[PDB]
Design a protein around this ligand. Structure first.
Ligand code: HEM
Ligand SMILES: CC[C@@H]1NC(=O)[C@H](Cc2c[nH]c3ccccc23)NC1=O
Ligand SMILES: CC[C@@H]1NC(=O)[C@H](Cc2c[nH]c3ccccc23)NC1=O
Length: 395
């Protein structure tokens, strides 16, 4: 119909041109309709409006996650009949900030050493390869797998890692699998943690699941299972998608990489520019109005859901001059790659650490290049978190 359906099917790094058109329109909030559910939704694409939305206490993230809320995703992201309320269930047990605690600066200082070791080990193995090699399979996959085992869940079997990864790729989708396959993904994940979370949390290590389980009524197995599913969904396809996308951005900008090779102290700024420039989610961050309000003049009624596309905001020319240029020296406002306000990614420091290690491993080795044109890269169509099927590269 004449109301836009959402999302915009921009599964590659080419952002849908619709986002810029909506940004330039006379509306600061645009009504859309969910393709997967038919629910009405509002969509924000301007940086200035997005700041107002994500800093407004009248907009609730948790209320937008509740069953029956208008939503963009085709299937509810919980096992049927369960809360799907992991952060609140941790808060209920007295686990104030266990998430941010176990992912903050002290955790980076524990893990950054082996993270950089592993990035170097992986890249050094690639430096010995002939012909074309795959940076997705042979760099991003082992690095992200080690990240999830060592920092989030505990030492996983290869079969366990393969299983959780498949559940993430199957359930976190707008399309490409059946309804039944999508629910079975969130079923199989929840069933998986109900049985194995206690054992995983009990092994020696610093992993977040152990911290959650071993912090001060006892922690129910349903809450520990909800925490496991939370860490997979929030930590696994995001890190793997982003690292793949960041590598593509670097390979597409050899002049920038040459600068980082010569001046490695500029890597942290390049990390921030990657977080702004490289797209990740194909949907949007969402919030529910808990009372009638106006945002930039547009009246929103209690119960309505307003979305912000982080990609659209990160490419807003009102915020970032030449927004479609990858400019590591950039000194613009804070990017939205980790969101904004109360729900700012609590994994942001760990993510920055793994991104930095990846950038350094690339910048240290001149000659790395994409083996084919960018438009020939194949993409997993329909994922919430963009990811190419492979990244063929050569020296
Ligand atoms: C490059 C990697 C990552 C990116 C780009 C990213 C991005 C984001 C963004 C944009 C949000 C805000 C969502 C919103 O406002 O509704 C968020 C929230 C969150 N992130 Fe990250 N993330 C990454 C990695 C991770 C990792 C490794 C973890 C580890 C578990 C993690 C855990 C979380 C959690 C639990 C939330 C929910 C916070 C809340 O709703 O209050 N993230 N992330
Ligand atoms: C993480 C699960 C849960 N659900 C939410 O809608 C928000 C936003 C969010 C952050 N990371 C995601 C990965 C996949 C889907 C949604 C999200 N916060 C939550 O904690
Ligand atoms: C539509 C299905 C799913 N629902 C969400 O709430 C998150 C919000 C979000 C936007 N960009 C991100 C990057 C990393 C982690 C979370 C997010 N995105 C989704 O795609």
């Amino acid at each position: 119909t004449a109301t836009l359906t959402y999302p915009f099917h921009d599964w590659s790094q080419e952002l849908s041109p619709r986002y810029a058109q909506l940004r330039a329109s006379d509306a600061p909030v645009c009504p859309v309709v969910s393709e997967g559910t038919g629910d009405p939704l509002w969509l924000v694409t301007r940086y200035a409006t997005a700041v107002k939305l994500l800093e407004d206490s009248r907009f609730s993230s948790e209320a937008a996650q509740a069953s029956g809320a208008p939503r963009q995703e085709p299937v509810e992201l919980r096992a049927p009949g369960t809360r799907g309320d992991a952060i609140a269930m941790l808060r209920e047990a007295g686990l104030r900030s266990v998430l941010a605690d176990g992912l903050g600066p002290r955790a980076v200082r524990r893990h950054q050493g082996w993270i950089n070791d592993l990035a170097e080990t992986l890249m050094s193995e690639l430096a010995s390869r002939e012909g074309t090699f795959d940076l997705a399979a042979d760099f991003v996959e082992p690095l992200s797998s080690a990240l999830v085992s060592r920092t989030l869940l505990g030492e996983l079997s290869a079969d366990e890692r393969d299983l959780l990864a498949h559940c993430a790729d199957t359930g976190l989708r707008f399309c490409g699998v059946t309804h039944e396959e999508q629910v079975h993904a969130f079923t199989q994940m929840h069933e998986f943690f109900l049985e194995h979370a206690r054992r995983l949390a009990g092994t020696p290590g610093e992993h977040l699941l152990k911290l959650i389980a071993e912090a001060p009524g006892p922690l129910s197995d349903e809450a520990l299972a909800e925490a496991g599913s939370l860490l997979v969904v929030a930590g696994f396809p995001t890190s793997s998608g982003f690292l793949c996308g960041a590598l593509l951005t670097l390979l597409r900008h050899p002049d920038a990489v040459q600068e980082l090779h010569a001046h490695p102290e500029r890597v942290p700024s390049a990390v921030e520019e990657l977080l702004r420039y490289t797209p990740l989610s194909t949907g949007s961050v969402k919030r529910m109005a808990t009372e009638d309000l106006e945002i930039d003049g547009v009246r929103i009624k209690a119960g309505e859901v307003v979305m912000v596309s982080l990609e659209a905001v990160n490419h807003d020319p009102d915020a970032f001059e030449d927004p479609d240029v990858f400019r590591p020296g950039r000194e613009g406002p804070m990017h939205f790659g980790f969101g904004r306000g109360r729900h700012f990614c609590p994994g942001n420091r760990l993510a920055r650490c793994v991104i930095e290690a990846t950038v350094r491993a690339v910048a240290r080795r001149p000659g790395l290049r994409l083996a084919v044109a960018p438009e020939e890269i194949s993409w997993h169509e329909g994922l919430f978190f963009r990811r190419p099927r492979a990244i063929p590269a050569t020296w």
